[PDB]
Amino acid sequence: CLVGGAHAFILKISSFCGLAPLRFEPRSQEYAVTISKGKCFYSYILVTFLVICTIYGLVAEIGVGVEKSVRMSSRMSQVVSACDILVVAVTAGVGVYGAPARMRTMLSYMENIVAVDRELGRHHSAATERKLCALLLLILLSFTILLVDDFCFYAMQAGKTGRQWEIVTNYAGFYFLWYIVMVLELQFAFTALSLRARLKLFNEALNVTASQVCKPAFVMMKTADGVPCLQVPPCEAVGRLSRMRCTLCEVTRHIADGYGLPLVIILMSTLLHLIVTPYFLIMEIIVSTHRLHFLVLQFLWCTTHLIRMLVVVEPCHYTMREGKRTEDIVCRLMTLAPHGGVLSSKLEVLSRLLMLQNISYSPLGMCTLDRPLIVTVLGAVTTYLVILIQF
Amino acid sequence: CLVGGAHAFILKISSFCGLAPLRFEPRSQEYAVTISKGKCFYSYILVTFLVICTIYGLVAEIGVGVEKSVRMSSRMSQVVSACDILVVAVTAGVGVYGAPARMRTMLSYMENIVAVDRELGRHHSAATERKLCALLLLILLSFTILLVDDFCFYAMQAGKTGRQWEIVTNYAGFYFLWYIVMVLELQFAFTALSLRARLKLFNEALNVTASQVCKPAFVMMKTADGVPCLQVPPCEAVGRLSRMRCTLCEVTRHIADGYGLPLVIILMSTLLHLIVTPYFLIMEIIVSTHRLHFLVLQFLWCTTHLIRMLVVVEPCHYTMREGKRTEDIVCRLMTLAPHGGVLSSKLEVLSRLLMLQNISYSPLGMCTLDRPLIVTVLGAVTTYLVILIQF
Amino acid sequence: CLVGGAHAFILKISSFCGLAPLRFEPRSQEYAVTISKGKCFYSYILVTFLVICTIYGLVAEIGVGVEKSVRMSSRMSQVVSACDILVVAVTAGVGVYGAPARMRTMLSYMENIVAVDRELGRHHSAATERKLCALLLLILLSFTILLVDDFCFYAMQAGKTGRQWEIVTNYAGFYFLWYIVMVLELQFAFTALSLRARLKLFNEALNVTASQVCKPAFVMMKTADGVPCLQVPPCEAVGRLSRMRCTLCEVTRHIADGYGLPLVIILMSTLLHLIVTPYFLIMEIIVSTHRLHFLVLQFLWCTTHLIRMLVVVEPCHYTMREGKRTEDIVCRLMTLAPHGGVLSSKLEVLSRLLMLQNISYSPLGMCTLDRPLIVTVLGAVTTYLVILIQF
Amino acid sequence: CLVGGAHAFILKISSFCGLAPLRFEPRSQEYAVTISKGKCFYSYILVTFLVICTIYGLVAEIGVGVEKSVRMSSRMSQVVSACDILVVAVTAGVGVYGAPARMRTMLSYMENIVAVDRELGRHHSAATERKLCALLLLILLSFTILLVDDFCFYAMQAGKTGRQWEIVTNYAGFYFLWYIVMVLELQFAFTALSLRARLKLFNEALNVTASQVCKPAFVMMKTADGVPCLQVPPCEAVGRLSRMRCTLCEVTRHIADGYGLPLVIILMSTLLHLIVTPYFLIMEIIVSTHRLHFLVLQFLWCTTHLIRMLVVVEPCHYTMREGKRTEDIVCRLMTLAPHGGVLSSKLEVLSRLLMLQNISYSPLGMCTLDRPLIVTVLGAVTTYLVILIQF
């Protein structure tokens, strides 16, 4: 098995988190990849250690009570902080303990994607992977910088009373589990975008099928000018592309299964944090609005909990749009195809595939990842805030 | 008519409840079954007796007022307890009074399922039925143990003032109606899972149809190694399987009709209890949090009201997934099938059946049983609790 | 044009309300029907008179203020009573002013339904029309009896202080507008059920098509035993039935257009009244619970506002179920039909009609009339009541 | 490129707003149109100037505080006024800065619509364009009159204390941004209605196809009587119309993309204003109800925020209805078409296009513009108001 681009890059990053217990073997543009049981062992230790340190750190700060426990200014603030920590520990737990089975799934289906790549002539655009690798760095580095500021702030807030080393021992684990949760979200997105790039490329082979029938080996090649061009009759190409369309839908279901449970806990904790964080921001902007550094951080957290949702639902939406574009192309193409020909009989099949096999991500069946899920989540958030804030 | 496995086992359990007024006649791996009017008569008496005892027990505890009526610490607590008892008495009532007509329906369609079993070569996996029979015992015995603890607790709470025998006379009926409601939920689930096992087995016959056309009597048999293998040409098999697909969809509609009204009252009472039970738990964890045994029981009830919902919606979701798997297989299979052949003409039919006949449970048309119903119910529960608790 | 049964009976009742400005000419089992401009003129006067009397009666009771205005015990109670009266006056207004155009539509499509009746051999079951005519009498007479009790109660409540004749002059108009709104709801239901009976009868002709192909003039006749039997080859019958299926879907869209705007205002006022009526019931059962006659009436109103919703959504749901039954029959029938025959080519067409033309009522596009609309309405009602009642 | 009617008229109006940076060249019934970079430059200046003046005007009135700041009678009233201004400045910003790319899109697809017009024989009905041009004038002039009254009122309210010139300098910019937002909404509606007129006209060519096959060059012409009549065999017409159906669906997706982001911000601000405006109306009708001129204006604003929503969702709904009418016609037409003919093979294709390519507007994928979006928005509005008003 081989992997490249920003998907291969996030797997390197995820390996240290224990989210991708893989060995990597550098080729020209790709790495060869296999499971490593030693990294699974390391990965299981790391997250278990961090969860123990996080729970006992939580117990310690509850034991300090509500006066000095900066995250826990009240009995109810203790419960909120415990649930916040709990959902992150559960999300990072499911993320890391599930990772070996998820990589076994990835290496299983990637052998079929390689066959699709050959038919499409897939080659990794350096400019495009640089865009997506820069986006990994942008999102992940920005979040890492936020975690450091949040930790430094609360440590200095306690450092004003000499208690910073205890705060470090009690919360350092929680910030590492935060990093693991974002890397898991980025690992999905750039896995899903890596498939969306192949639907997008499959649709271009189907357009050039239409242009050849409109305006008359592996399926598609570059010309001497590098433009896409078709090496086989459209009758054969549509049959070959119909098989590839089935394969891409199967890969979608493996991705949605492997990340399905993580994504549900990520969605609930997003919803939780988008209620909890604006609430205490609003309470603190009405009362003691002089704590400007706190208010800045809590705003940047509200922003981050929205981005973390978009990182999940947007890669899926962009995959839906490529499916809709296929239906548009096939409709056009089958009005062009002549009556009673072989090509139109191949397009009768493909159009049934479009009606039968949709491409979608529905984690555990609870919901469909698409932009209407944003409207659903934000409508709930504002409903609860209007209830909670108004009194 | 004959029935086996965990479905036949839950029918034995349900017979004593009067939910399955059947005689049973043991064969090698199955029971022969027919309606017994005497068990219908017994069943109608039993539930009518228990409902009378429950209503008059409710009247008695309202008559004791709010001081000593342990379930009724206030005027509003009286109304809550009356509605709790009322929905259980209605659910057990519809369950037991409807049971003879429901068994007549079961024995009507099971004669067709036997024909599907012959074509598929269905035989009951001892290991699989042991799994599902152990799951019946696990869920039902755990609930029975909870009912005993709840009853013993409140009787001892009253026994501290000598009034336990009156509590026994006033609530024993209600705990038996609770048991009847769970057995009805388990009777559905293991009826639905018994069908899902046959869709799952029908899909495997359709995969081996694809492998024979990919890599070239009743439809399917075991090899000498026990692997599935096809005794007829794929052209005949797909036609035979299309007929069986229609039969399974028809059986789904009989199950959804027979249990439809029970399931709606089960869903409302789940929603009611998931509001009422966490509310009084939260009031009692803020005030008088020393009543640790009460808080433990009320938590185990909240857990149970979630499980009772999953027992209903999960068997249906797992049945949807087998239908989606059929669409995936048929798409694959009809790209493999050659142009203009008989097989592809048989697959044109089957693909129309998939678009026309879905397999789903929609009780009384109110809703579809699937995991999105969990999100809908839990979002309402938390909306009401946020309203009720916040003031 | 001719019409019979409970549909023809409700048109007689509706004529006096001005909801069906028709002449009627009695035949053996049917009436001949044509528009009468004189009844349109009468109808426009009647509702305009009743609306004037109702508005000026409302103005009078607002002018008496909140002390003696029994419907208006507070400033807010004035606003509630005004909106209650307003939505009924608007619903009866749209009902009666729209009625001539609606009857022109009815007489337009009923000429095509007569053609469907000939093909199906439709004859009116005396026992069935007696059921539906008894249901008209049951629902309408029960409501009329409730209106009289409500009016007599409030007149006697004012009659205890001699003011009953003013109450009569100020509210008699409103009770007649209430009667007009129910007759409009019954006029829809028994129009929709009159179509559902023809889908139900069309599906039976399609089953006997299957039995003739399974077990081998106008389309269908009774045997000498009165059992349905087919007078033409199944190849012709399926073609003839496909045309009739199109005609029934067209009639559905005329009904949904003609009653669409009434039904939306009926749904909002149902939602309004299911909030307003339980609220003031709950306030009056907590405080001054001795007003037993008031509490009884307000409960019977809550019951009536639910029934008025079911009268609207249930006839539509039962029409959906007959469409689903067609899809089940066509799937079965086209697995039975032989490969490459004419019959299977006719069933390819019909199955496309089922996928393209659904049968549904969606008033003004706002919603679909089906039992999920009950869950939507009742969830809102309980959301508002939980907000309003809890403080 | 050429454009006519109320679409061409709203583009003239939009040019001064900078929403359509176009030159216009008058022909007999149409204008020739091309992008003008000078109007893009003017347009970017104008909105940037107005946004600067609006923000600094907002800063000034916040700087005057809450006593004299008539829009800002409290600290919370400051925040409300700032968000109101902010969403309008954002909506007008996206409107005007996006306008050049949107016009490039319009001139791209309008060249294909001209081809559809030739096939359909499209000519602009003077009476119909007069209706839609009068509707532009009615809606836009009525809104302009409301803006003047609102501005004159608040200036005179401040003019009673000599501060009117400062109010003019601080709010004149905001009223011009309000005008730009309505013109953008009208620019969409009359673009969408301009397409709906061509679906409506395409459906009439398909009916006359049915009548010619029922009752036996560019596709369609007027007779010597001006009735539509078909110049080609139905076999060719259905093929030609299938291609045109694809082209119209493509144009729909360009419109939805170009206006998609504006429409989402328009929907949120509609939702915001339908909460905020009735709330402060209700507070001001309970307390100080003597401010009759204020109450009148705030009611006319509530009315306007509903109309602004209908202006957006109704043109889209009317486009859905023409698609449904196509499905009705195609079903009818393909029962009429003879078995095994060429025409029925052309109708097999078109019916797949109807199942694959729907016509809809879904801005950014968040929602579908149709009348169910009204019910969704108004249910939220009343939920928040019931929460906010009740305490």
Author numbering:
A (entry chain D), B (entry chain A), C (entry chain B), D (entry chain C): 16 to 231, 270 to 444
Q: What does the original paper state about this entry?
A:
GRs mediate chemosensation by forming ligand-gated cation channels. However, some GRs do form functional homomeric channels, including D. melanogaster Gr43a and its Bombyx mori ortholog (Bm)Gr9, which are selectively activated by fructose. BmGr9 is a C4-symmetric tetramer with the ion pore on the central 4-fold axis. As anticipated from its homology to ORs, each BmGr9 subunit contains an N-terminal intracellular S0 helix and seven transmembrane helices (S1 to S7), with S7 broken into S7a and S7b.
When expressed in Xenopus oocytes, this construct was activated by d-fructose, but not by D-glucose, with an EC50 of 22 mM, consistent with the published EC50 and specificity of wild-type BmGr9.16 We produced detergent-solubilized BmGr9 and used single-particle cryoelectron microscopy (cryo-EM) to obtain a 2.85-Å map, which we used to build a structural model of BmGr9. The BmGr9 structure encompasses most of the protein, except for a disordered intracellular S4-S5 loop (residues 232–269), and the N and C termini (15 and 5 residues, respectively). The cryo-EM map of agonist-free BmGr9 contains strong density features that do not correspond to protein, especially in the intersubunit lipid inlets. We assigned several features to ordered phospholipids rather than detergent based on their well-resolved bidentate shapes. Four ordered lipids (one per subunit) project their head group from within the hydrophobic region of the bilayer into the aqueous ion pore, sealing intersubunit fenestrations in the pore walls. Each lipid enters the pore between adjacent S7b helices at the level of the inner leaflet. In BmGr9, T435 and Y437 form polar contacts with the pore-penetrating lipid head group. In agonist-free BmGr9, starting from the extracellular face, the pore begins with a closed double-layer hydrophobic gate formed by F444 and I440 at the S7b C terminus. Like L473 in AbOrco and V468 in MhOr5, the four F444 side chains protrude into the channel lumen to close the ion pathway down to a 2.5-Å diameter, creating a hydrophobic plug. Below the hydrophobic gate, T429 and T436 form two rings of hydroxyls that can stabilize cations.
